[PDB]
RNA sequence: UUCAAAUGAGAACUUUGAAGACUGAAGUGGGGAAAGGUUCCACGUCAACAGCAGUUGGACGUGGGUUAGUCGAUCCUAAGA
RNA sequence: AGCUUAUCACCCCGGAAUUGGUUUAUCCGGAGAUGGGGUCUUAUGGCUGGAAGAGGCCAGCACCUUUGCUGGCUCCGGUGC
RNA sequence: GUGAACAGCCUCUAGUUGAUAGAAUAAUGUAGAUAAGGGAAGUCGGCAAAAUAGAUCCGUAACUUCGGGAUAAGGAUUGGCUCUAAGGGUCGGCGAUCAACUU
């Protein structure tokens, strides 16, 4: 999984060109963080309300 | 490519450290090459000949600057141990082991400190004359 | 643009009869390095120049505001 | 001395974060005059449950605190959803990003 | 559609080049409706157009190499490629040295460690050489004063 | 240029006001021989000195 | 040079985004003089032109746009007329 | 814009060999040096006014707006053939 | 940034990604590159190519209008890492303190 993380970040980064966008300004879906936090082992009953 | 091809030609071939070992081994060999009568063709007219780096310099000061250098120390640090003959090459493969081991203990006992003392006499001779 | 030290000349300027407008500015400043305090800048708009008075002590500043003439328009902040 | 104050209400309420693990990370990974294990009378990390608090007589800065907190969030896989921000001077807090449905 | 004018205007508003500014491809009609810098500003603040922070140029390697140079590395004959003069002029060296020697003698004369006549001969001797540095000048001064009081 | 004289600018203004196609209500006229503007000008094709 | 989407009857060539590269401060940058003269900008827009293509264009059709007591000319004289 | 600030230059005192002062570069001095005090040009810099109210960096909050409004920070330094 | 350097190489800001495309990889060409042993037997002719090349040190002939020739020629070296020494300024009646790259 460490090697998989490295391989993912290799594609994700591309840093010598264009300065990865900040997350302050972007917006993400709901469902994505559902999957992420379920995989991490949390539950989303406090977020579904919201 | 060009560098290896044009440096390591058999025309420009140098003098095979085995033989430099066999030469620095004994007294008469080193004194002969320190004496080296006047030859019109040799670079330094004979004299000023380094034996480790089998090379004729022009002058005493060119010998000094050669000895105060890493090109000399490369060779002296290469020539300390045994000289890697075909005996070693075949003893590694399982062939004439006892000959190799006799040669090894012979160098360790007899020939090693012989050559070391010869090198030390050479060094203080050169440092005193230069 | 010009600074003033005296008070009498600021009053004369307020009563110069070519002044229509003034303005008070409040700044928060630190003294030496040390303590917050309230600087006040009384600016008056002449025809050619803008005259200004720097008052560090608010007590004297508000008494200056009182002694200002009444017809003169003033602008706060 | 110098005091710094982090708030952790937002993630802790929705159940992604535990301040005790965050303080357990800080109290060991904070460096003084070199490496870990020199917080002798100089630094005090203490939690309440909603607010973590640091008090330091030694060299310590809000950028260092942010660096440590972002490292912890990357450890627990929270960098891509939470940000450490300043609300007032030396008063910081964790906040979710602008995720909308 | 064609958001060329919008990219240009967003660059001119934000104060960067077009290579930075970013248009979310989902809000295409909302961006194409815009034909004014006020509208572009609205789209800047609402989060439809952002700034794309700077492409980095780090100096960790340069600072490390400079630190090794301070420590006395990467300076040998294989790294030297210009003459000693081009690297450091002897005129500059002599200027430093002579200013130093003049300043020292001035301070000694003003303090009273030395008289104006010995100052005068030392000035011209240091204008010439035979005083290689502060140490040699101080030692010569000490020898002079010692033989003087000996006389 | 950009520091023109008024003579040059006046000639330029005449050229701008001339730089048009032909109106359509002239096609519809009794005994109309004209079908295009043969004295039309473009900055890249011909120069007007 | 490439990938997806959008537009469109139609996309190797247009737009956006995602990548990879280039000019590398004696620039493929930012401004000016001479010359040019609206080529600037917008809206529509493809018959002809852009030695392939074209939904694009310095093209085609219609409009908008150049604000000075302080920048310049204007004034002075130079070689000269 | 106000106050202050300089190399050269100049003024008063005084009268110099045991010749002294001095530039990286050797010139200056009884036609008055060194030294002590002072005067001037104010290019140039420093403080203040202009001026933080501007601009910049962040944080928000309306979310129904084709302009919606608040809060914080904007400090102190260092170095060179 | 390297480096003596506005050289050459890479990069930041800003800008561009324009020059008809696709599939194969025959000869002959255009632009380059390598080659055993021999080394100018080639050719009108060493054309062209190769070799040399920067910096430190040693050393440098005839001739000379005494100014040069001269980088004559010909030789020893060059990395990295850890160290030593020397080279300065400001204050205190030798010390405290600060700082740069040159050997
Ligand atoms: Zn040798």
Contacts of E80 (CB under 8 A, 6+ apart): E87
For residue E49, which of E13, E83, E78 has the smallest C-alpha distance?
E13
Shortest CA gap D77–chain A (Å): 8
The rounded distance, in Å, linking the Cα atoms of A23 and A12 is 14
Q: What is the DSSP letter of F25?
A: G
Could you give phi then psi for residue C50, rounded to 5 degrees?
-115, 115
Q: What is the DSSP letter of E54?
A: P
Give the structural domain span for D6.
Answer: 1-101
Across D27-51, b (16+ Cβ under 10 Å) vs e yields: eeebebeeeeeebeebbebebeeee
C-alpha pair distances (Å), C24 with each of B81, C40, C53, C71: 93, 7, 10, 16
First-to-final CA distance of chain E: 104
C-alpha B77 – ligand 1 centre gap (Å): 11
CB-neighbour burial class of residue A9 (10 A; exposed 0-12, middle 13-18, buried 19+): exposed
Neighbours of D94 (CB within 10 A): 23
Number of domains in chain D: 1
C-alpha pair distances (Å), B82 with each of B100, B102, B112: 11, 12, 9
Pair B21, B109: CB distance under 8 Å: no
Could you give phi then psi for residue D95, rounded to 5 degrees?
-150, 135
Query: Among all strands, which nt has the closest C1' to E33 (CA)?
Result: H66
Give the 3-state secondary structure of chain C: CEEECCCHHHHHHHCCCCCCEEEEEEEEEECCCCCEEEEEEEEEECCCCEEEEEECCHHHHHHHHHHCCCCCECCEC
C-alpha B21 – ligand 1 centre gap (Å): 13
The rounded distance, in Å, linking the Cα atoms of F31 and C14 is 83
Q: Is the CB of E67 under 7 A from strand I?
A: no
The rounded distance, in Å, linking the Cα atoms of B115 and B106 is 13
Q: What is the DSSP letter of B111?
A: I
Number of domains in chain C: 1
Give, in Å, how far the C1' of I15 lies from the CA of E8. 13
Give the structural domain span for C5.
Answer: 1-77
The rounded distance, in Å, linking the Cα atoms of A41 and E114 is 86
For residue D34, give the 3-state DSSP assignment: coil
Neighbours of C6 (CB within 10 A): 9
Could you give phi then psi for residue B102, rounded to 5 degrees?
-65, -45
C-alpha pair distances (Å), C38 with each of C4, C5, C31, C35, C63: 18, 18, 10, 10, 15
Q: Does D77 touch chain A (CB under 8 A)?
A: yes
Give how far the C-alpha of residue E42 lies from the chain's centroid of Cα atoms, to the nearest Å. Answer: 43
The rounded distance, in Å, linking the Cα atoms of E67 and E61 is 10
The rounded distance, in Å, linking the Cα atoms of E46 and E24 is 12
- Are A15 and E53 in contact (CB < 8 Å)? no
For residue C12, which of C60, C51, C61 has the smallest C-alpha distance?
C51
CB-neighbour burial class of residue B43 (10 A; exposed 0-12, middle 13-18, buried 19+): middle
Which residues numbered 28-47 in A keep a CB inside 8 Å of some CB on E? Answer: none
Pair C24, C76: CB distance under 8 Å: yes
The rounded distance, in Å, linking the Cα atoms of C68 and C43 is 12
Query: Among all strands, which nt has the closest C1' to E110 (CA)?
Result: H35
- Angle, to 10 degrees, between the axis of helix E90-111 and the axis of helix E116-127? 180
Pair B106, B87: CB distance under 8 Å: no
Where chain D is broken, by preceding residue (C–N > 2.5 Å)?
A: none
Q: Does E56 touch chain A (CB under 8 A)?
A: yes
Pair B50, B105: CB distance under 8 Å: no
Which method resolved this structure? cryo-EM
Resolution in A: 3.0
- Closest residue of A to E56, CA-based? A19
For residue E49, give the 3-state DSSP assignment: strand
What are the start-end ranges of the H helices in chain B?
Answer: 2-7, 17-24, 27-35, 60-67, 70-78, 86-91, 97-106, 112-129
First-to-final CA distance of chain C: 19
Query: How large is the C-alpha radius of gyration of chain B?
Result: 17
The rounded distance, in Å, linking the Cα atoms of B67 and B73 is 8
**Dihedral angle over CA of E52, E53, E55, E60, nearest 10:** -160
Pair C72, C16: CB distance under 8 Å: no
Contacts of D19 (CB under 8 A, 6+ apart): D8, D12, D47, D48, D49, D50, D52
Sign (positive or negative) of CA dihedral F6, F7, F13, F17: positive
Q: What is the DSSP letter of E55?
A: P
Sign (positive or negative) of CA dihedral E56, E61, E64, E68: negative
- Are A28 and D99 in contact (CB < 8 Å)? yes
Q: What is the DSSP letter of B93?
A: T
Q: Strand ranges (DSSP E) for chain E?
A: 22-23, 49-50
Q: Does E25 touch chain A (CB under 8 A)?
A: no
- Angle, to 10 degrees, between the axis of helix B70-78 and the axis of helix B60-67? 70
Helix (H) or strand (E) holding D44: strand D43-47
Pairs from B16-24 (Cβ < 8 Å, separation ≥ 24) = B17/B75, B17/B78, B17/B79, B17/B83, B18/B83, B18/B84, B18/B85, B20/B51, B20/B52, B20/B54, B20/B79, B21/B79, B21/B83, B21/B115, B23/B51, B24/B51, B24/B52, B24/B79, B24/B115, B24/B118, B24/B119, B24/B122
């Amino acid at each position: 999984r460490q090697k998989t993380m490295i391989a993912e970040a290799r594609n994700r980064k591309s840093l010598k060109n264009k300065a990865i966008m900040p997350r302050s300004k972007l917006t993400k879906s709901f469902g994505k963080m559902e999957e992420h936090m379920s995989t991490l082992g949390h539950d989303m009953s406090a977020l579904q309300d919201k | 490519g060009r560098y290896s091809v044009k440096r390591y030609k058999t025309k420009r071939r140098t003098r095979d450290l085995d033989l430099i070992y066999n030469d620095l081994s004994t007294k008469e060999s080193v004194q002969k090459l320190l004496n080296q009568p006047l030859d019109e063709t040799k670079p330094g007219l004979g004299q000023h000949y380094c034996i480790h780096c089998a090379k004729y310099m022009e002058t005493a000061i060119a010998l000094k600057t050669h000895l105060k250098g890493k090109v000399h120390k490369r060779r002296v640090k290469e020539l300390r141990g045994v000289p890697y003959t075909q005996e070693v090459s075949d003893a590694a493969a399982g062939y004439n082991l006892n000959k190799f081991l006799n040669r090894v203990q012979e160098i360790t006992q007899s020939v090693g400190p012989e050559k070391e003392s010869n090198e030390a006499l050479l060094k203080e001779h050169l440092d005193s004359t230069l | 643009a010009r600074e003033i030290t005296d008070i009498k000349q600021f009053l004369e300027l307020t009563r110069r009869a070519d002044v229509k407008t003034a303005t008070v500015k409040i700044n928060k400043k630190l003294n030496k390095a040390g303590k917050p305090f309230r600087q006040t800048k009384f600016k008056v708009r002449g025809s050619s120049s803008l005259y200004t008075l720097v008052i560090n002590d608010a007590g004297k500043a508000k008494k200056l505001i009182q002694s200002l003439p009444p017809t003169l328009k003033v602008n706060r902040l | 001395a110098k005091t710094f104050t982090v708030d952790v209400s937002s993630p802790t309420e929705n159940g992604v974060f535990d301040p005790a693990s965050y303080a357990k990370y800080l109290i060991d990974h904070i460096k003084v005059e070199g490496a870990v294990g020199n917080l002798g009378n100089a630094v005090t990390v203490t939690e309440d449950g909603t607010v973590v608090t640091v008090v330091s007589t030694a060299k310590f800065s809000g950028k260092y605190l942010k660096y440590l907190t972002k490292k912890y969030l990357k450890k627990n896989q929270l960098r891509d959803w939470i940000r450490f921000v300043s609300t007032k001077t030396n008063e910081y807090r964790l906040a979710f990003y602008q995720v909308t449905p | 559609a064609n958001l060329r004018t919008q990219k240009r205007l967003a660059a001119s508003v934000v104060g960067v080049g077009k290579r930075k500014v970013w248009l979310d491809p989902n809000e295409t009609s909302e961006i194409a409706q815009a034909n004014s810098r006020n509208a572009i500003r609205k789209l800047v603040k609402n989060g439809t157009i952002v700034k794309k922070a700077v492409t980095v140029h780090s100096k960790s390697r340069t600072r490390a190499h400079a630190q090794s140079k301070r420590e006395g590395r990467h300076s040998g004959y294989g790294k030297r490629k210009g003459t000693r003069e081009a690297r450091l002029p002897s005129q500059v060296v002599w200027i430093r040295r002579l200013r130093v020697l003049r300043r020292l003698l001035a301070k000694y004369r003003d303090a009273g460690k030395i008289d104006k006549h010995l100052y005068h001969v030392l000035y011209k001797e240091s204008k010439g050489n035979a005083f290689k540095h502060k140490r040699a000048l101080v030692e010569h001064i000490i020898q002079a004063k010692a033989d003087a009081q000996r006389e | 240029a950009a520091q023109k004289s008024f003579r040059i600018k006046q000639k330029m203004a005449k050229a701008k006001k001339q730089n048009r196609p032909l109106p359509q209500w002239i096609r519809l006229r009794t005994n109309n021989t004209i079908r295009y503007n043969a004295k039309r000008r473009n900055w890249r094709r011909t120069k007007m000195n």
